Design an enzyme around this catalytic site. Structure first.
Site, PDB file in Angstrom:
ATOM      1  CB  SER A 151      51.960  39.896  81.034  1.00 38.94           C
ATOM      2  OG  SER A 151      52.830  41.020  82.129  1.00 38.94           O
ATOM      3  CG  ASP A 333      47.139  43.252  86.424  1.00 34.50           C
ATOM      4  OD1 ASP A 333      47.657  42.799  87.722  1.00 34.50           O
ATOM      5  OD2 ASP A 333      47.219  43.916  85.162  1.00 34.50           O
ATOM      6  CG  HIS A 389      48.125  40.508  85.435  1.00 33.50           C
ATOM      7  ND1 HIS A 389      49.075  41.063  84.878  1.00 33.50           N
ATOM      8  CD2 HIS A 389      48.898  39.553  84.596  1.00 33.50           C
ATOM      9  CE1 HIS A 389      49.698  40.790  84.125  1.00 33.50           C
ATOM     10  NE2 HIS A 389      50.268  39.794  83.978  1.00 33.50           N
TER      11      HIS A 389
HETATM   12  O1  LIG Z   1      50.148  37.444  83.109  1.00 41.23           O
HETATM   13  C1  LIG Z   1      51.359  36.649  82.135  1.00 41.23           C
HETATM   14  O2  LIG Z   1      51.490  35.959  81.232  1.00 41.23           O
HETATM   15  C2  LIG Z   1      52.821  36.413  83.007  1.00 41.23           C
HETATM   16  C3  LIG Z   1      52.476  36.627  84.597  1.00 41.23           C
HETATM   17  C4  LIG Z   1      51.624  34.456  84.801  1.00 41.23           C
HETATM   18  C5  LIG Z   1      52.031  33.514  84.316  1.00 41.23           C
HETATM   19  C6  LIG Z   1      51.292  32.047  84.259  1.00 41.23           C
HETATM   20  C7  LIG Z   1      51.088  31.947  85.681  1.00 41.23           C
HETATM   21  C8  LIG Z   1      50.578  33.551  87.115  1.00 41.23           C
HETATM   22  C9  LIG Z   1      50.992  34.326  86.350  1.00 41.23           C
HETATM   23  C10 LIG Z   1      53.415  37.953  83.297  1.00 41.23           C
HETATM   24  O3  LIG Z   1      53.047  38.558  84.495  1.00 41.23           O
HETATM   25  O4  LIG Z   1      53.736  38.683  82.095  1.00 41.23           O
END
Ligand SMILES: O=C(O)C(CC1CCCCC1)C(=O)O
Ligand SMILES: *[C@@H]1O[C@H](CO)[C@@H](O[C@H]2O[C@H](CO)[C@@H](O)[C@H](O)[C@H]2NC(C)=O)[C@H](O)[C@H]1NC(C)=O
Ligand SMILES: *[C@@H]1O[C@H](CO)[C@@H](O[C@H]2O[C@H](CO)[C@@H](O)[C@H](O)[C@H]2NC(C)=O)[C@H](O)[C@H]1NC(C)=O
Ligand SMILES: *[C@@H]1O[C@H](CO)[C@@H](O[C@H]2O[C@H](CO)[C@@H](O)[C@H](O)[C@H]2NC(C)=O)[C@H](O)[C@H]1NC(C)=O
Ligand SMILES: *[C@@H]1O[C@H](CO)[C@@H](O[C@H]2O[C@H](CO)[C@@H](O)[C@H](O)[C@H]2NC(C)=O)[C@H](O)[C@H]1NC(C)=O
Ligand SMILES: O=C(O)C(CC1CCCCC1)C(=O)O
EC number: 3.4.16.5
Lengths: 413, 413
Positions: A151, A333, A389
């Site tokens: 992400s 996602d 995601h």
């Molecule tokens: O997927 C990820 O690493 C984060 C979100 C995620 C962080 C850890 C806790 C769940 C959401 C992002 O979208 O940048």
């Protein structure tokens, strides 16, 4: 050879002792930053297996999410006490370095506790942390190095890779980004389409969006100033993110239910586990450090985003033809939807374009379609069908299979 | 009052005896047709609960699919021997009449064994079968009557409803169609969009489809004769239906794996159960009748489709303002995708249009979004989020909740 002082001896919650060595300690970043790492050696041939950095995003969220809930050697159970071995762990075939980053995230800290940062500083601090890692683990200096993440690490990883490529002492071989933020514009434009064609918007709103945001075949749902377009996009934003749908997986429940931790997520198990004083002791965490949170509110609050697209970074990385690049997306996602990243890779306009094909994984159940792959020279885009995601949480076998083909430069099909 | 000779006494595979009475026997259709029915009385107040006809589609497939695998009082287990009670059974609140139709389907037959038929004859034969049902069960002549079904029964049910509305002795109150075939043109056009926006087609094929099949904002993926358009649509057809994806649920595995029972489906459990001679005896099935199949190959082979759209039927049914109509679609089905039917309902251009809203179901887990509802006077379109072609199999609670609100003329929200 390796830092014995950082080795994890007996981790609470495990019913059997690991076959592999693992470490938890601090890597020095820029200034007074100390980034907490958890390094898990390959279950098979650690000496010669690749070294793989994993970063979660946020910005301000912990890469221990990656370890304990996505693709680590063991995963935390709902009791927040028990850890179970993960049969699809990425460390079956790699030495995986989970890095809590930037400073202030999770167990990471700085001596002055000033955590306002930006993309450029984060990249430079991660680069210095990696140099420190190799000083601590000189036996891993020559292993193949891959930089991977999720992400927001769609920004972290290509910007870091650009620094790393300039350091010939690092054996950089490739990068992989899961549901990565690669272009705000491609993400925003694709999301609106995604919302309509997944049944979240109706005809009335779609017709209006088309009339007000689009000209001929081209829609602008990114920086359009058309008045009704903006209003419509505010309604789309509400439906997608503020109405009780799980933005990270459209077909999953929203944790805690529909409204009257980012919405719909529940990180209590990891937080319960990690805040156990005996777990902190086993992880070599100084007692003085504040409570562990999945995401640091202040880091995210004060974070200055600088890049709006990774186009230049990926073209730089592809120019050398030294590195294999993978962008992979769970196709349910909505936070970083698959289509925006597929558009992104296509728009890099690379040579040796391959026809788009399904890629396969063997289940029981036989061979099944795990998603689709669009490949070019040195770069592939892949979907993971039915994953959100957090791809390895949702489809751990498919994720492992894809990761193995990536590491080994094997066809994705 | 009711046909004691058709009552089912002790059904094999049940560990506990039913609280409700149930019947299995034959309803007389047109000519020499005898349609096998399985009628399951309401678990609560059978005397005054509505009578609900259920039809599966094909054409040529058995409504006992509906009973034993979708929403019956008990569902067949993978051993093909054991039946387990269904806590989300539609007969919790209704007297449900499952009808194997037309003649030749499952245990249905005709004295001359001539099973070539068409939409008009099927409608008239089902109408006569219903008249026979009321002759056999005169105590149910005054109960509220709903006509319901799936997929190809999207044609069966509106055409039957048009006959039934002309018979004042039948207390017709509404109809519900799940993932129904309502318009070939709306289905075909929506499917192509569905395929692209669910990641099954890439940019190259999408650009070509847009160039060759579409003019300005309007695409014709239905009866276009543009040469390259046809070629592209042949490739879409291949990917969607002939490549190892499950057309009935995009995110489900394909039963039996990717190719070298319609593809990807497995009806062995129902077939094993129903072909047990003791089950046939308990179901009052004449010994002379051939083996039970989920779908009759000859019925489907010889079936003449006559209607290309149900627009006229639904307008006729809506004209009286006597009947409540529901079209509901699992939104991961590709055989009869949700969007084509949403377009279909919208295009009926009815009065008292309501803003599209989410509809909710209470899980543990709290309230969750179960899908979206678009309502007009006397007709609603609803999605079931994360369900495929067999909505009650995939999301049994949401299906039951929707069915209960439909039967009771309650808001879907
Ligand atoms: O997927 C990820 O690493 C984060 C979100 C995620 C962080 C850890 C806790 C769940 C959401 C992002 O979208 O940048
Ligand atoms: C968030 O997750 C936590 C931890 O997984 C859930 O807490 C409980 O979950 C189970 C159901 O009661 C219990 O078996 C666990 O013992 C308990 N775990 C802990 C650490 O307390 C909690 O229900 C979740 N919250 C929501 C709303 O989803
Ligand atoms: C990103 O953060 C860095 C570090 O805070 C910024 O870099 C500079 O900022 C300070 C304040 O002006 C200077 O005193 C430092 O010398 C300088 N640090 C380095 C190593 O360059 C940088 O400006 C920030 N970028 C943006 C656009 O805000
Ligand atoms: C099709 O379904 C049948 C019946 O459900 C499956 O048959 C078996 O399934 C289980 C796994 O071996 C066993 O526990 C059952 O006893 C057995 N059932 C019967 C009636 O034989 C079969 O595996 C399925 N086929 C495929 C390819 O999915
Ligand atoms: C649908 O099937 C029916 C019944 O077979 C057809 O109706 C007619 O067909 C027979 C052959 O021409 C006639 O002899 C019957 O009298 C007549 N039956 C009735 C009750 O109308 C009908 O033509 C078929 N429809 C189409 C378009 O094929
Ligand atoms: O859904 C239905 O009723 C059938 C298909 C179904 C019949 C029973 C066995 C599974 C497929 C249709 O699409 O018309």
């Amino acid at each position: 050879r390796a830092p014995d002082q950082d080795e994890i001896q007996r981790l609470p919650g495990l019913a059997k002792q690991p076959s592999f060595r693992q470490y938890s300690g601090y890597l020095k970043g820029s200034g007074s930053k100390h980034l907490h790492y958890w390094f898990v050696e390959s279950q098979k041939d650690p000496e010669n297996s690749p070294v793989v950095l994993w970063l979660n995003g946020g910005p301000g969220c912990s890469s221990l999410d990656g370890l304990l809930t996505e693709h680590g050697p063991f995963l935390v159970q709902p009791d927040g006490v028990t850890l179970e071995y993960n049969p699809y762990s990425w460390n079956l075939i790699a030495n995986v370095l989970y890095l809590e980053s930037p400073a202030g995230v999770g167990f990471s800290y700085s001596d002055d506790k000033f955590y306002a940062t930006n993309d450029t500083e984060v990249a430079q601090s991660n680069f210095e942390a990696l140099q420190d890692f190799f000083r601590l683990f000189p036996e891993y200096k020559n292993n193949k190095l891959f930089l991977t993440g999720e992400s927001y690490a769609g920004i972290y990883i290509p910007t870091l890779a650009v620094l790393v490529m300039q350091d010939p002492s690092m054996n950089l071989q490739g990068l992989a980004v899961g549901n990565g933020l690669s272009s705000y514009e491609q993400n925003d434009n694709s999301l609106v389409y995604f919302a309509y064609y997944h049944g979240l918007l109706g005809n009335r709103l779609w017709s209006s969006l088309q009339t007000h945001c689009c000209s001929q075949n081209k829609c602008n749902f990114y920086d359009n100033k058309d008045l009704e377009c903006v209003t419509n996009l505010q309604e789309v934003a509400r439906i997608v993110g503020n109405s009780g749908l799980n933005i990270y997986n459209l077909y999953a429940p929203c944790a805690g239910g529909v409204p009257s931790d980012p919405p719909c997520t529940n990180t209590t198990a990891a937080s319960t586990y990690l805040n156990n004083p005996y777990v902190r002791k086993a992880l070599n965490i100084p007692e003085q450090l504040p409570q562990w949170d999945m995401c640091n509110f202040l880091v995210n609050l004060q974070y200055r985003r600088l890049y709006r697209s990774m186009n230049s970074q990926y073209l730089k990385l592809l120019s050398s033809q030294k590195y294999q690049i993978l962008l992979y997306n769970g196709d349910v996602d909505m936070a970083c939807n698959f289509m925006g990243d597929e558009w992104f890779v296509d728009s890099l306009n690379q040579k040796m374009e391959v026809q788009r094909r399904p890629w396969l994984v063997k289940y029981g159940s036989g061979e099944q379609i795990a998603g689709f792959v669009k490949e070019f020279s040195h770069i592939a885009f892949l979907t993971i069908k039915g994953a959100g995601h957090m791809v390895p949480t949702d489809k751990p076998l498919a994720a492992f299979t894809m990761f193995s083909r990536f590491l080994n430069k094997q066809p994705y099909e």
